[PDB]
Amino acid sequence: MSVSAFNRRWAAVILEALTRHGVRHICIAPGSRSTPLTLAAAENSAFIHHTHFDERGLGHLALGLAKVSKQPVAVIVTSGTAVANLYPALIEAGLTGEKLILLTADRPPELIDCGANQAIRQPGMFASHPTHSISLPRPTQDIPARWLVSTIDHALGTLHAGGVHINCPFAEPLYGEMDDTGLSWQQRLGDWWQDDKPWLREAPRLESEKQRDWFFWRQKRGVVVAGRMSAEEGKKVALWAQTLGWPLIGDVLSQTGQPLPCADLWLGNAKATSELQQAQIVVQLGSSLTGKRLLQWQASCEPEEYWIVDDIEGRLDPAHHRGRRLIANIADWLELHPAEKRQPWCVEIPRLAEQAMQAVIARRDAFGEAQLAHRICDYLPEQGQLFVGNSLVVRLIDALSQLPAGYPVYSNRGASGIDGLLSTAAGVQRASGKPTLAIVGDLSALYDLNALALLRQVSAPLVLIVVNNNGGQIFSLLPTPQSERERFYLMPQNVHFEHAAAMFELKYHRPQNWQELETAFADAWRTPTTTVIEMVVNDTDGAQTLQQLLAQVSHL
Amino acid sequence: MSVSAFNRRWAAVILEALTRHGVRHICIAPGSRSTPLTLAAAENSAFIHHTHFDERGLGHLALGLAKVSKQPVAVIVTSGTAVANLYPALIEAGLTGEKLILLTADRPPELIDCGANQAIRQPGMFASHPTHSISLPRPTQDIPARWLVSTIDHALGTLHAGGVHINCPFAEPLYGEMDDTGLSWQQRLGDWWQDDKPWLREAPRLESEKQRDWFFWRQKRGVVVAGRMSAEEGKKVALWAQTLGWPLIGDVLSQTGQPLPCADLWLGNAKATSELQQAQIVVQLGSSLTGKRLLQWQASCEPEEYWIVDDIEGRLDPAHHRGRRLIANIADWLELHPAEKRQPWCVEIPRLAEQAMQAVIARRDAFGEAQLAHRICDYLPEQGQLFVGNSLVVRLIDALSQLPAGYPVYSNRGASGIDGLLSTAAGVQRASGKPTLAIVGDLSALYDLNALALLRQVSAPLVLIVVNNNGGQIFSLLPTPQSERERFYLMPQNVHFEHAAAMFELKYHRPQNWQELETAFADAWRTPTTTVIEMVVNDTDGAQTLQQLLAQVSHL
């Protein structure tokens, strides 16, 4: 009888189904059409609920929660452009593997393509970007509940990685007190309601087999390249490479401890590339390599075989080497392909790497973003985590700093968007409950400005450093044309962030030197709140310092 | 020879072609991959160039420019999530007809699906929402320029309404001096380069035929419903209905002068709906009707025929009446189907409409948002335009005010998103150069908060009223459940906007009464700048006032 009640019973099956697949966090934006999902979510004691008014930020909040928790995270939005705003986070999840379950409320079929308010064509609107797409039918008791839960169970069970789009049409009436409509329909699932398992368990695992000729290849002159991986994996890779006696090129995202630091500099030295030409195999673990010199060396090197080990699917070598693409958990893969103690074969590169780091240390004093990057390991929160933004900061830390082995680093380096860094950082913090250092540029902070609202609720101190070099100064590093560079590339906005912090009642510091910066950090880590630290620097100093250090090390 | 040079020659053909189809405005966001497009655009003197750092706002800026200018507007963004951020404005354009030309830079095919930075699958990523989608091939001189310009001319030439997605892959190198690579390839177009017309002229017109039985139907008892249309159209429709003697129900978006105002109130009176039961034909011009009582009357009425005249395509009647869907320019359609002077047939409704307005007038004094809506006609800038936001404000103005005939009203009421209202208003202002009054709610202002950067550049005064009722109070009008209402619907953010204005160096007022509001208005219209006026009101007063006035008029 009651459409509004059955709507909520239908939605209740969807949300309860998700709890059987480890969904704990659910992120909700406001709306009317989403009522059945949102009320079902509110009533379900399994969930931790997060809310936000910007669906683009909401998507990135979910991304950050999923990134850290390694759990699928659900999102509820209403029909219309609210759904479209999830696209950026969905795309990034597609690339880096976060499991985002997007429950998107829709108008019923009778209200599509007839000029109805807030009604658009939603099925398939994210194209190939979701791993799974489910277009649910118009709710009816004539479709059994066992079908509905089975469909959700299939999507979640077979999900190796990435996003799921679950489009959810509901007809009005949406409101009214609940009667018993749909109760007997729900009760057809029997004691599944009191169970802790899915209705349908479908969970095939995707994994490459052991390479049986590894014991042959590990005897050769190899190189280990470490890309993005977990903090624990980084430590394991570091020990493994050391035992092999193979040089380890470690990305800022690797948490390997970077035993040959400043690779973006010493890879620019012909003596290094000459030595690396002796490598017969490269084993890369993880992906999304950061540095330009590393990506250039990757593109140029011609080992007999190039292997990439990672737990995400598809090709990961943009230079298309002859070799192997091995899908595996990195820690597991290392146990299957163990190192045996062997004499190191590289002689020149350790020397060069030490000289490179010394060159950077020689320039540590100036109060600039290159120096902040270089020294960032002095400001990492104890037992905390680092969220690095995109553009120059990730490149400068990668080139100029040596981050501690096993110290957790998080980022959005799939598509490397500057559109969701603050809201992602909020999710990263909330998921782990750890003190968090996040560092972003000024255009990045502006892009996701309203995410400062989310940063008013963190469970441990979060320091947000905004490096303000007045524009996108990556375009001063790149060889952009001088005539058009300022108006069409850099796009300086000539703002500061003191009033933004004040608007959201966040503590704010604008340190003018290292002493004030250290005092600001000392102040910030004291309370479970977000502190904004704006570091104002001269526009092109960071880019020019990198260029100068590159030139200096290349002549070593 | 030079890939960087040819990239720019290929892009130059694309941008020059657009100038032959009335594209004057181009909106550009920063990136490296977009370099060929962006430099080609920068070099082309036909364009007015706009920039912004948030691509979602950039899309809405373009939407606003197109909305007012009635010409196609181009957009350039780089590859990755930048592209995804254009979705909301593209969807809105699909519904209300703005011609947005989206030039989205892409990686070349060899860098897709191989773990390359900022490379995603872009062709088809907007699904069915663009009117036309072009996936350009990897640039090569082996494809003649005449094909490239012809393909663009086909897309723009046959564009009745809505967006065009032009995906533009470019391979590196992107930078480098221009040599003569591609010059002879371009010159194959001969003196087209000096012409003012397209290479291929393909411009069929889409239009319904004259209704040959109109002289029969115009003598029947009809009702005219006026939805969204141009300001000039509003005036013509008002005169046309008056001549026919048919009652005119005029939307806030119609600019008809609303001769039977407060329709959202008096349509709730059974005596009005009883009189309307005599209507044998309803002729609706324009669409996207605003008010609940009007949408409910539309759904319940059963005239012999229901006609909708509008210049956008497809079904526009969400109640699916037996009738006609007539595609035409509204002014042209009225000339093709002229009115005959006939005696008005409605007697009861004019009485009710007068009584309804008196009821609202009785409550004009309180300093609340309902009163602001009612009185807004008294505060319109001379020779200006109104941009009305979504949620309560558009509904309160529609229900409670009588806007002057022919006074331009602009809005985003296709999908009615609250995600781009400030940036749209910025585009609306820049397109017309007129003094602009924009009114939005607090969550709306937060959603598009960084668009205040754009409002730093207006060519005439813009007053931005932010109605702060601490949350989405439309969900206090809707029968949402009380227990979950605050956390999961209203989502109060408990902020003010004084610091937001200050951040972007915009004048700010927080008036405490009408005198102070009028003083703020007086100061604001004096300079070509944006003034922020924050009206802080009691959260649920506006909703409750509307509810009470509805009840009051229903009992007349």
Ligand SMILES: Cc1ncc(C[n+]2c([C@@H](O)CCC(=O)O)sc(CCOP(=O)(O)OP(=O)(O)O)c2C)c(N)n1
């Ligand atoms: C949503 C979107 N849209 C546009 C872009 C293009 N884009 C970039 C990519 O080229 C960098 C990808 C990467 O890190 O590899 S970096 C950049 C400027 C950032 O300025 P900033 O925050 O002040 O920092 P700074 O440059 O260090 O001064 C832009 C605008 C994007 N990435 N995402």
Ligand SMILES: Cc1ncc(C[n+]2c([C@@H](O)CCC(=O)O)sc(CCOP(=O)(O)OP(=O)(O)O)c2C)c(N)n1
């Ligand atoms: C991008 C997106 N995402 C979510 C929504 C859902 N949604 C609405 C639709 O229900 C209203 C469509 C309409 O106007 O017809 S209104 C609304 C809250 C607005 O709060 P406010 O600005 O403070 O104004 P107030 O309510 O008067 O206090 C939301 C969140 C949306 N529209 N667009």
Ligand SMILES: [Mn+2]
């Ligand atoms: Mn910057």
Ligand SMILES: [Mn+2]
């Ligand atoms: Mn509000």
